[PDB]
Paper text:
The disease arises in mice and humans from the misfolding of the acute phase protein serum amyloid A1 (SAA1). To investigate the molecular basis of the systemic AA amyloidosis, we here use electron cryo-microscopy (cryo-EM) and determined the structures of AA amyloid fibrils from a patient and from a diseased mouse. The human fibril encloses a clearly discernible cavity that contains many charged and polar amino acid residues, making it likely that the vacant space in the cavity is filled with water. Both fibril proteins adopt all-beta folds and differ sharply from the known globular conformations of SAA family members. The murine and the human fibril possess in-register, parallel cross-β sheets and adopt highly similar β-arch conformations at the protein N-termini.
The human fibril proteins originate from human hSAA1.1 and mainly represent the fragments hSAA1.1(2–64) and hSAA1.1(2–47). The ordered part of the density of the mouse fibril corresponds to residues 1–69 of mSAA1.1, the ordered part of the human fibril to hSAA1.1 residues 2–55. The dominant human morphology is 8.1 ± 0.5 nm wide and possesses a cross-over distance of 55.2 ± 1.7 nm (measurements were obtained from cryo-EM images). By contrast, platinum side shadowing demonstrates that the human fibril is right-hand twisted and contains right-hand twisted β-sheets. The human fibril protein contains no amyloid key fold. The human fibril exhibits a considerably larger interface containing polar, ionic, and hydrophobic cross-stack interactions. The center of the human fibril is formed by a steric zipper, which shows a self-complementary packing of the sheets β3 from the two protein stacks. Our reconstruction shows that the N-terminus of the human protein, which lacks the N-terminal Arg, is located within the tightly packed fibril core. The N-terminal α-amino groups form salt bridges to the β-carboxyl groups of Asp33.
Residue numbers in the entry:
A (entry chain D), B (entry chain B), C (entry chain F), D (entry chain H), E (entry chain J), F (entry chain L), ...: 2 to 55
Amino acid sequence: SFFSFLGEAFDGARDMWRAYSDMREANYIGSDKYFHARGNYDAAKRGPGGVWAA
Amino acid sequence: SFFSFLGEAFDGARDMWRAYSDMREANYIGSDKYFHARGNYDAAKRGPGGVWAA
Amino acid sequence: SFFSFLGEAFDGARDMWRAYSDMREANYIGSDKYFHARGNYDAAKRGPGGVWAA
Amino acid sequence: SFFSFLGEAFDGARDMWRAYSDMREANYIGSDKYFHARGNYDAAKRGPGGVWAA
Amino acid sequence: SFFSFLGEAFDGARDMWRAYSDMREANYIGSDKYFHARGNYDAAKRGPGGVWAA
Amino acid sequence: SFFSFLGEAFDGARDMWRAYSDMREANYIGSDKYFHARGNYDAAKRGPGGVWAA
Amino acid sequence: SFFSFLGEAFDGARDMWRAYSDMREANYIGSDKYFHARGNYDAAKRGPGGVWAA
Amino acid sequence: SFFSFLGEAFDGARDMWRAYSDMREANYIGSDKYFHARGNYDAAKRGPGGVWAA
Amino acid sequence: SFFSFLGEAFDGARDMWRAYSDMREANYIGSDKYFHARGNYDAAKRGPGGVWAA
Amino acid sequence: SFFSFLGEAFDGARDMWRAYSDMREANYIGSDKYFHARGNYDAAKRGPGGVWAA
Amino acid sequence: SFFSFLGEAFDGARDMWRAYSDMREANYIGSDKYFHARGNYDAAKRGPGGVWAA
Amino acid sequence: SFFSFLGEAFDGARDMWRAYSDMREANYIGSDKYFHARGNYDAAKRGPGGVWAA
């Protein structure tokens, strides 16, 4: 389960539940980057992202 | 489950549930990048993305 | 479970639950970066991200 | 379990539960960075992130 | 369990539970950085992060 | 267990539980930094982080 | 990569590479079994399986 | 990478590489079993498995 | 990396590399079993497994 | 890295490298078993496993 | 790193490296068993395991 | 690092390196067993294990 909200038989109010997270490059199992690396050049660009709510 | 909202028999109010996340490049199992790499050039560009709500 | 909210048979109020986190590059099992590395150049850029709520 | 809120049969009030954390690069098991490294250059940039709630 | 709140059969009040932490680069088991290192240059930049709630 | 709150059959009041901590780079088992190091340069920058609640 | 064999420019011999494993119910990320469970009965049967080479 | 064999420019001999493991129910991140459990009955049966090489 | 063998420019001999392990139920991060448990019955059966090489 | 063998530019001989281990239920971070437990019955059976090489 | 062998530019001989260990239930950080326990019954059985090499 | 062997530019001989250990239930940080316990019954059985090399 990732960010699953389960509500039952309730009386909700305003702004009641908030789950905010930044999980970039998290939760790796056996996942290698440049494991046997020689003479490499890494200049990859990644622009803005995520959630921008106003 | 990813971002599944389940509500039953309730009285909701304004702005009640929010689940915001940035999960870029997360949750890898056995997934390799440049595992046996020699003399490579990485300059891939990725522009803006995500959710922009105003 | 990651950020799962479970409520049952309650009377909620305003701003009641908040779960905020920054989990970037967390929770690694057996995940190597530059394990056997020689003469490499790492200048990857990553822009802004996460959750920006106003 | 990461940031899972479970409430049952209660009367909630305002701002009742808060769980805030900065878990960047935490919780590693057997995860190596630059284990056998020689003559490497690390200048990777990472911009702002996390949770910004106002 | 990380930051899991479990409440049952209660009468909550305002600002009742708070769990704040800074866990950056914590909880390592067998996780090496620059274990056999010679002539390396580490100038990686990491911007602001964490939880900023106002 | 890290920062897990368990309450049952109670009458809560305001500001009742607080658990604040700074656990940066804590709790290491067999985790080495620069174990066999010669002629290295460490100038990695890490910006502000943690929990900022106002 | 799972069980990928890559050989190049070699002189192989008999029984040269063997990779045997039992990975049943391994490598879970955020995957819950009976998370909020009450009064359940689990008697599922699973017969023999795996690799039987003679 | 899980059980990946990479050989290059070599002269192999008999029975040269062996990687045997029993990884059942290993490598869990945020994966809960019977997290909030009450009055459950678990009698699931699982037969023989794995690798049987003769 | 889990059980990854990397050889390059060598002269191998018989029975040269062996990596044997029993990793059952190892390497857990934030993974709970029977966290808030009351009156449960656990009698799950698991048969033989692993690697049996003759 | 778990049980990763890296050899380069060598002359191997017989039975040269051996890495044997029993890592059952090892390496836990924040992983709870029966944390808040009352009146439970644990009689789960697990058969033989591991590596059996003859 | 767990049981990682790194050799470079050498002349190996017979039975040269051995790393044997029994690490069952080792290396725990914040991992609780029966933390708040009352009236529980623990009779879980675990059969033989580990490495058996002949 | 756990049981990591690093050799470079050498002339090895027979039976050269041995690292044998019994690390069962070692290396605990903040890890409690039966912390607040009342009227419990512990009769869990664990069979043979470890490394058996002949």
